[model samples]
Target: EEQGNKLHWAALLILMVIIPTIGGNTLVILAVSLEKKLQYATNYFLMSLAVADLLVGLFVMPIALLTIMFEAMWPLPLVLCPAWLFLDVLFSTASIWHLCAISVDRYIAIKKPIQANQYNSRATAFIKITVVWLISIGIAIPVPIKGIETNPNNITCVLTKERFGDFMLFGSLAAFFTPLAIMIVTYFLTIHALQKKAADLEDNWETLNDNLKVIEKADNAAQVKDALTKMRAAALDAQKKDFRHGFDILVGQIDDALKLANEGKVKEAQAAAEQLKTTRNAYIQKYLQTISNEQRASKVLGIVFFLFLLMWCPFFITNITLVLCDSCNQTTLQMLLEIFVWIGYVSSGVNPLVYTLFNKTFRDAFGRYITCNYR
Candidate 1:
């Protein structure tokens, strides 16, 4: 009992948390690896996510299990303590950065489908994942070097809480916090995009409903009036005229974006997507705009954001709150801290379930692999 809360902690982690995390993330990786078609420019980002989660499950969580169970004290020998702290910072930072990259990738895919579709030809995903590791190693390396000390024989690893106060703030901004901000803004716009899609569908439904009623009443003398016939013809003509103009405008914007991309202006090209108005076009304009796919991407992002916030918000907010609280009771604070960290850890296990297992493509691959049907 003096060791820690062995009942809940060990049982939850070993049985439900650690094993499932390892298996789920491993399944995600295997599913992607087996599906050759999934080697898309976009799915590389998902691969990065899986790798980050896998690292967390493999390297960080076991140590974290001990840290949490021991209630923030490093029980292991002081010799390996610096290594422990370094790993904690490294994997956590890498994971957070992966999410940021994911949000950006999602945004680009939705807002500029054509360019972002085959966008990884430059190996940008690999480069981004590399940068994530570099930044992570940079952050963790110095912390251990600077934070460790010795009284007699063994080195004692104690993080500088005072310095870490500033560092973690900066780290939070650089990683999870900023990604959450981007997710919020990007997905808010995405919600608008989704609504625009719905509005267009409703308009089409109404248009068809009117046609059906017109057909049903066509034999009636009153309903067969020339005035009504002339009105319907005019409506069709006006619709064609409006669509022609809209299609021409969309084509112009698409050309501008493509031109910029061809000129090696990727950032400018991304901005070009911002220039086009995404009013739902349902005629020849629809085929030309080709943004329904983009809207779907936005919707997927919206779902991702909701799941992320559900699993992580309380943990994030509590971490900030605990740091600022000066008058909190010690025991209550301890329990709350553990609870919130558990929430965060639980999120690591939740990602694969939400992002992969539920997806039909991923599930198909996963089923094949498990059933020995995968090539």
Candidate 2:
């Protein structure tokens, strides 16, 4: 009996939301499924997130829209309220866990590249996703049990702090706040490690450049030999697993220059060293390009996390506040909560747009799918 003009606008807004929310996440799922370029474990993690978001679109938002249309009361049978709330909590909690796990996964990849690769398989990712789903179910299960017990007033179907104060606090802490903190801290650490790796690579290149000059200018064989050995080692170490084939040839050139210097041909050795410097410059350009691509990928991931935090933060903060505070006007706060919950729902659909905006692989796949060019 209390619904006003706001309910009409909300119904329209969420009806619009349902289309892209379902369609976009479906695109994400299909892109990850069909595109070979999107086959990494990280993509698998994102696909799991899409699954959760997709379910939110399919199950959560539609029902929510129906309730809004029915003037904030349960339009369906009484038993379905808790079931809807269970899925509502479950998928959203799973969504948070998926993002948290993705941040941790990326941090592991950046911080411990070698060991992380060994376990960064689809099987391992699926297991982690399964664990996420299980935890989500465990935390959200009590909501339905409590809902079933307390919901004798069948017309109103909602989870309020007044009805389930303890679960509200526990669920908010365990599901939203904790995972949000982890995702933020882990993402920052990942970026820090990436920056350090980039700095080390630059230092290695600078050291190599100086040693190359020593090889070119130094007249004595001992100095040239010492410079060549040090430069070659540094170059190899910087190459790591990136560009080995060309670096091996460059190493051979360093050896050739060393042999020439030892054979008492200083001028010839310096000429070969010049050629080596040119080749090294070419490889360094490639290395820098690769590193920039790495940085770009991380930047896109940062945007995704930022959008998540931005959209979800308002709802969660208000939710917890409504629980703890007693002085606030209940009617106004309830109205704001209704608005904030929709804002949170909007986040489910924004992820695919982020992917398509920043990443070529996702962009191309989305375009191809839209144009019906799936080959």
Candidate 3:
């Protein structure tokens, strides 16, 4: 029954957890489910997080804490122990994969805010959730069922692994590191996108720097407005410049249509006329979209992403380190591992604040909820 030297400390950390995790995640589920206005499609990703977090806190955290208290002794029968460990890995892994799905959504939304709206469908969300579930199950179930490779005893239970580098690497890559890499890359991408817009504005200043006259602020704004106005007013002129191309194509079609009509082929002329309607609209759409760029609404999300990564990194890093080095337990390393694991566990409590409290969409609904309750 010998363990590490931190009974009081372990109890303190355990007390600090559980309550907020359960309470905050409970609120997350209730807010998303009960509030009609919160039922937006993007919130479906959030709902997945809430469900995963709830499951993690319920099925994973408490048992792991008890394992810590008993100092690696799995107090349950061997029949129940591995199954419990499987659920622990399953839902914890599911939570990370769910976060990955959220990151993917964020990146898509940032890169194409206007066009990305189609992804906000129930069908799309379900498909994403199903994919996450499958990946989580695939990596999680096989390893634990195969049993702890190097660190189990007749009397004690250990969560350590060994000899299965392939599974360990897959779980670490698929669930953790890959998602974090995506978010970091996407953050820089958002900056590049904004910088491009700012540079386009600079281009305006250079183009009209001397050709047009303007005062400090008002006329600068006015002149830019006037510039775009003048530019748009020349749409007819631009079309005229392309008129030769249009005329050549239409002329060939019209020539054929008239020859067919003169030859009494009335159906051919009508068919060509109908085809013009489709191509003409296609040309107009390309012209309009080329001139307009949608500035993505992703800046606010970046800060929350920062908070999420900070809390979760250490725990996952330990897993990767443990996988690579079977001799990783040097007492201090074991102590740090326990801390990092608990830190990651408590992050579920932090998400409600990150996602909802800071988000205006959820904040507005939260206000309504508060008012409704007060009434």
Against the true structure, whose lDDT is highest?
2
Number of the candidate with higher TM-score, 1 or 2? 2
Local lDDT at 18 for model 1: 75
Question: What C-alpha lDDT do the candidate models reach, one value each?
Answer: 0.61, 0.79, 0.62
- Candidate 3 residue-wise lDDT at 106: 62
TM-score of each: 0.68, 0.89, 0.67
| Candidate 2 C-alpha lDDT tens digits along 1-375 | 743555666567656677778888888888988998888887888888888899988888878777555665676888888899899999988888887887787777666655445354767898888999998999899987776443256567777666777787878899888987887787778778888888987898888788877876786878887887887676666656435576687888888888897898888888998877678788778768866876787788778777877898888887877888889887788889888888888876666556655777888888988887877
- Can you write out model 1's per-residue Cα lDDT over 1-375, one digit (the tens) per residue? 455356576667777777877777777777767788776766776776677777777777787777545555556777677777677677666666666677776665544434433555438877877887887787677676666655366543444435566565565565467767776776676666556655654565455345434434444333323322332333332233445564465456555655664565555654544443243234435533455666655566567656765676676665555566657664665567567666666676657556765467888887777777867
Model 3: CA > 4 A from native:
1-7, 116-120, 148-155, 163-166, 197-230, 233-297, 323-329, 364-375
Clashing pairs in 2: none
Using TM-score as the measure, the top candidate is 2
What is the alpha-carbon lDDT for the whole of candidate 1? 0.61
Candidate with better lDDT, 1 vs 3: 3
User: Can you tell me which runs of candidate 2 are displaced by over 4 Å?
Assistant: 1-7, 71-73, 113-120, 150-155, 241-247
Each model's backbone clash number = 0, 0, 0
Number of clashing residue pairs, candidate 1: 0
lDDT of 3 by residue, 5-30 (tens): 76676577656776666766766677
Ordered by lDDT, highest first, the candidates read 2, 3, 1
